[PDB]
Amino acid sequence: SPGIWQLDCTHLEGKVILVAVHVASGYIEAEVIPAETGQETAYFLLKLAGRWPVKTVHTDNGSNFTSTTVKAACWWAGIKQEDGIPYNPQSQGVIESMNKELKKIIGQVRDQAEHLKTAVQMAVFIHNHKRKGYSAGERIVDIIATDIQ
């Protein structure tokens, strides 16, 4: 549970926003990339796993599941690479809702930056700090600290 992350790819302004969600907390990291490639996804996972104890990643699609560069990143970083099949149908809905929420926040901040990447990082900040009560940022730290102890 503490180590499980899900990848998610959404599109805006002709660009791709790649998101990793910590399943148990709803905490996210995200970046803007010109297109989803194996190299972009691999580099993103490398960053993520240096920052959080990433044990398992549910990949966002079959191309990233297949990608030897993504497999190489997962090997390097000690991540178990898994598929992202929603065996629990509620999983689809959760990711869909999150993409809608993120896009809403990006709209609310869009005029506070020229570049989409800046707006996306503002959206990450707002998402992670939002109290729903604890924030996703608080939940992830508590979950992982409990695991360590």
Next chain:
Amino acid sequence: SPGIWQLDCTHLEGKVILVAVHVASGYIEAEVIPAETGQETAYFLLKLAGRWPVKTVHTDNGSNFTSTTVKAACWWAGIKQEDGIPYNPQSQGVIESMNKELKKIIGQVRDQAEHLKTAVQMAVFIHNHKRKGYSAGERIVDIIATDIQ
């Protein structure tokens, strides 16, 4: 002190490696940039503060302390921007040691990637996971979780 970070700028291969250190744990985030501008520093702080509860940042030099773009990022993200004067002389030594350690790790991984940015992220991973026995990644989570509780 759970919320205190220090910026650090070091150079390699004609590029700049910008580092943020969580003082209490030694945990780091880092990125490669072409040069250390206010905008680059502002964007880096924006990313950091969306990911960790950044209360205070000791800036790495007077130019980043002065920069209105850096001040704007700190305002946006709710960060108290401070100078980085080593009133405690041991502070210089610690940062210098860390830069030396990071460069050593980058050397050890350098042939496992074409691009410096990839090597730097490998180095971040190795640094944060190294047991010294807890790792910096464990220490930061424990410190922050204790603060929330």
